[PDB]
Every structure is written in C-alpha cells, then in structure tokens.
Symmetry: none
Subunit: 306 residues, 2 copies
Amino acid sequence: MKELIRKLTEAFGPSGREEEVRSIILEELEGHIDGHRIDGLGNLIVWKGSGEKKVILDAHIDEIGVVVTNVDDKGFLTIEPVGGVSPYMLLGKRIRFENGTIGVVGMEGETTEERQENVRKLSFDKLFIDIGANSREEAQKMCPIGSFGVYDSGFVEVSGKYVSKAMDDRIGCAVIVEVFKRIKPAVTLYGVFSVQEYGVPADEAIAIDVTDSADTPKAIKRHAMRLSGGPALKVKDRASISSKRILENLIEIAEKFDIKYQMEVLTGIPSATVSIPTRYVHSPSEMIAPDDVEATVDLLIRYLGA
Amino acid sequence: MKELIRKLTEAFGPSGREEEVRSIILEELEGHIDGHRIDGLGNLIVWKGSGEKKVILDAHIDEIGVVVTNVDDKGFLTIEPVGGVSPYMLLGKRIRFENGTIGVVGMEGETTEERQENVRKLSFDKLFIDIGANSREEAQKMCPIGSFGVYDSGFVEVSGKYVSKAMDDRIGCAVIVEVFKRIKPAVTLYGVFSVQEEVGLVYGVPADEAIAIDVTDSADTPKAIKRHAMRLSGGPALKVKDRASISSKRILENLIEIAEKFDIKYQMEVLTGIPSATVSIPTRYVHSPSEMIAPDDVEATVDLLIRYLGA
C-alpha cells in the first residue's frame, strides 16, 4: 500500500478541486471495479460484486487548506482557513496552489515586540502568503481571489511509520481502494469517495475515517487510541439497534480472524465507523502505522468477502 | 427562470435541515461559478469574476415549518413551530416530512363549543398530526421526535403569478442564482446562501458592498389602505433604512440611478460592518402555503443587479 498512500496523500484536493484525487482513485481501481459514476456534486461512486446485501464504504476526499480572500497592492495574499487549519500550523510554512504555484506564509509585525504580541493570540488576519509577486496584477494572474491552497509537504517514511499531509482522509480512501483491489465480495460493495463539503440504496454503510492517536508525551488518558492498536471501532450513543449490530459484527470478525482492534470510546441507513489512529492530525506531517491500515483492510475483507 | 423557482421553492429545507436546498443551488450553479465553499456556520459561498470591487449578494435558504415534539399512544404527533408559522395556517393542511412521510393536521375538540372555543384562541398544543400510524412504535419509526416538516404544497401558476411555499426567501436565492447564470461580472461577485439563526441564540469574506435579496409584504390586497405600500409588478423594492451609513446610502443611490437609466421598474420601501442595501421581491401571503409573486418583479430585480454589477 505504500505507493498507493504516497499518491493519494500527495494529490491536490481541497474542497471543490478534487479532480486529481478522483483520477488517481479510478486509475488504481481499473480492472477491480464493475463501474463508477461521478454525481453532480462531485462524489465518486464505484461498485463491485452482486450479492444480495448492499454495503457502502465511505471516505471523504477533501483535504484542509486555505482560500485566498484578498490581494494587496504589493501582491501579498490574505487567506482564510478551509477546514481545521490552525494559524500556528501555517507560520513559516509553504503552501501549494492548483497550478503548481508555491507560496510562503508570513506574519505581520516588524518589531520583535509586535511579533511576540501577535503570536500570543495568532489570528488569520495577521497572516499573509507571499507568492513572489510584486504587484496585485502579477499575483492575480498567478493566484486569483478564491484560489485554494494546500500544505506543500509530501510523503516520507519515518522509521517504519508513514508521514504525509492529508492522512485525513486520504488514508481512508486508500483503505477502500485496497479493499476493492483484493476482495472477492459476498455483498454488492459500493465505494463512496465523498466531497463532504447518496443515490445508492444500501443496507449498511461503514465510514472509514481517522481518529487522533493520543500516545504522545504527557498523554495520561486511559482507553486512548494508539498507533499499532489496530482499527478503531467507534462507539455511538444514540445508535439504532441495526447500527450497534454492525459494530458487534466487526468486533466478532476481528476476534474470529485474530485482527487487533481498539474501541473508540464515547465522550437512515444503519452505519458504523472504523478509524485509522493518526498522530498530528491537521498538521503537514500526519503520521500512521502501516500495520493499522493493513489490519483495517483485512477486517473489511473478512467482514464483506467470500 | 420558472423551473429554477419551482425547484427551489419546492425543495425541503426547514431551519435546521437545509442540505437539499444547498445541493440544488450548487447543481444549478455548476459551470457558472469559479468556486464555492461552506464555512463553519453552514453558509454556502460562491464566487465569479475578478474585478477590483467586491460585492456580496445574500439570501437565506431556510424555510418555516414544524418540528415533532411528542408521539402519543395512538400514533398522533404533537408539533411546535419552526420560524413564523401561524397555527391558523396549519388547520386541515398536509405536512411533508424529511423522509417523505405526509401528515394531516387536525385540531382537538369534539363538541361544537370547544372546537369554536379552540379555534378562536388557537394554539399549537390544540393541534396534532395524523400520519396514519396506529401506535407510538409505528409512528416513532416513521416520524421520530425531532423530525422536521414543511408545507406539503408546491409550485403553481395563477394567471401569470407564481404561487408556492417558501417564496421567503427561495425567490431571493433564485434571483442570485439567475444573476450568476447570466452575468459577465465587472466586479468580484460573491453569492452567500445563509442559514438564519434561531431567535434568542448566538461572513468570512471581505467585500466592499453587501446586497441582501429578501421578500417584503405586498400590501395591495383588499382593504389594505396604507401609504408606502409595496405592490406586485411595481418592481424591486429598494429599502430606505433609517440609520443607514453614508456608505450604505451611496449604494441605494447607485441602484436608483441604474434603475432610472435602464428603464427598470422599482419602488422605494420605507418602514412604518460592510456597507449594505436591501432589495426585496414584493410577495403576497407571506408565511402561508401559497406565497405569491409577480414574475416581472423577479426579472426586473435580476436585470437591476446585472446592470449594476456587470460589464
């Protein structure tokens, strides 16, 4: 799965501009699916198998980023966050735009005191992006207002862990692709790669997401999700009887096929959530353990295969 | 523009559950916008054009409706209003719920005395909804407590007028969508399709002007004898706000000159942050299942905005 994860996480796909992610998913899936369609909103749906039960696997394809909301007379860009990007995560970072344009995030403030003041309550209105332009007209030609940017960081192996941008939720997309690549389905299996800001009848829906891995220094919460603890199965409070049955089925599959799993504890179509534990979510260096990803693929193949 | 208005007014989108309206707006705008996003509050923002002046057009997407608050042993539903729904508008009416269920609104009272007494001081606790269930369990599965409903009434032409539910403010959403479909912008044009906040509770884009597209009561029905009355076919109603800023008054004067220069009908409405103006569609029977507009007012409003914002 290494190369699949590299391609999906490094692909450009902020909200509304996910064409490259869809193309990679379809290229990886060719020869492994029976059909596909892209609805009016941009959701990619694929399907395989013919069993009587219909099951949806859903992961979202958007990644967090920024959107340009203004350009000044010297060509510097003003931005707002798209998704959960913290302004502290952007200081000194490079941002990649759709056409390959790279920008540098700076912070306002000339004196050392003003900068110390701005970082103590850092706000997006104190940030700007420098794309190397010298005027508004130069910047507009490169990066018009309304342009989306993403982290300019890529995939790297860190002593057996995988680190990239957009593990949330490209790792969920990767799991679904790998399931379709390997499975001999006992159900009719739909893969929904949603834009998340469907037209398919189904009996069950399983969302493949990420959850925060709380195993870094000074984490003292019991029942914390951790890397290499396996897929995290989500406990729901207001869940219907049918939703809780999906969860119990997955637990039974895990124990019967000897797959490690962990329970993510409480704080229309029946549904369950399976999550990949991830460190540093919403940073340019989200980190997963490949054995958790492989266990999640195995879990789904054994639950849905025959 | 008729089909756009039909689809928007008939769409399911009570305050709290406006997803289907947002999807229709985006599908209708496909190919006519440069981008879109949803902010934290759930507001849908679209944009087109690259001019130096930034203008927002704003309309809200939620409609009035009801919410199920209880289910009795015989399957009958209790409801409370969402937004400004009068119980008098619900008597004998059919309600459509999110999952497609249709319910009938009835009123308590068997004696002709308490019925007459109930209807002269009508409250929501005297109303119930019949969804055809025979027990609590059946009704819970069809329409659980917390479910939202809207008028089960649709779009109809009435001798050249348009009549539907939720003209307030789906006709404003329709104006903005149609502007985006037609316009070659001289500005950077934002469309903001907003959700209204519940009374008692509580955009991301910098811009030079914001223009709200709303409905205003058309006071041209029998026995309405008030001056300053807006009328159907009198054109867009330009709001004269009492405490308007210097910059907001400048926009209003701009729109008047545009309207006068291009022979666009308009009427001035006087009541009885970003510089802003309000442009309203005259509407009869607001908050009823049969809100009525004149298509020429809607066309004139789109024309006004295009002349003001387009090159």
